[PDB]
Amino acid sequence: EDSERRPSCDIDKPPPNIELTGNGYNELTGQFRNRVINTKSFGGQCRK
Amino acid sequence: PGIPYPIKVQVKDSLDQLVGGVPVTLNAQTIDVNQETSDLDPSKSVTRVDDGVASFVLNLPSGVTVLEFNVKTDAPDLPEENQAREGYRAIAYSLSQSYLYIDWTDNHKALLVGEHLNIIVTPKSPYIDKITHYNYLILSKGKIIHFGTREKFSDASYQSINIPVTQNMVPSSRLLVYYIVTGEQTAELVSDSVWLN
């Protein structure tokens, strides 16, 4: 409730579709796959 | 929470010796986890010369998190400026909101060898109404002398377990009661222990 230390330092927008890059890939079909690497996380280290 | 918590305080002199016949009182504030609190009624008692420890008992509601008590001495000769006061804080036990308690706080007083003792346990607010089994371990001198086990039935909310005492537990002992539950995502077990005199 009481979120101190300026959470997210007023950083609003992430990259547009980084989930597409983080998503899986297939070589024999040339079609992308489901997300594997969760890039939506931040680990606390805000990088503006 | 919800169970009367005994308070045993001792008064010692300047050089490592207990004092008796000195009336003492304490002020406690039972705080709520949700909102504002109220002041608990003070209690005053005297310390016995033969026992050396003053006995106190306070009953608290089920929604208390911590308590702070200021034990002060009361005597006709001791003024208010020169008075003995020592503040302390007691923190209760959880992610699954489950608790466990063992009772009678060794005030029997301390028991002998050969007589069976009953101890009441209570799994207040468990993860599920159905509990697999009861598990308790009595240890002494840093070693596990015996391991106990019981079953949980819906006959009552609190069950009394019988623990036989042996000759290897004369100086002191400890017992811990822990029960495991099966969660929907992750499990979490709750334990508790009280000294054995």
Partner: protein, 49 residues
């Protein structure tokens, strides 16, 4: 006199009580802290110590 000259030993169980690994009477914080205060270390999948 010997500042009282207490006794030769006078203590067999009081000095034997030092075998207890943990301190205090009992009870405490979450299972890890109370087991460390009681003098034990648990190994389970749910929680660590």
């Amino acid at each position: 006199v010997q500042r009282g000259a207490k006794k030769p030993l006078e203590r067999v169980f009081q000095f034997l009580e030092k075998s207890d690994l943990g301190c205090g009477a009992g009870g405490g914080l979450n299972n890890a802290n109370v087991f460390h205060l009681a003098g034990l270390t648990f190994l389970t999948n749910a929680n660590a110590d």
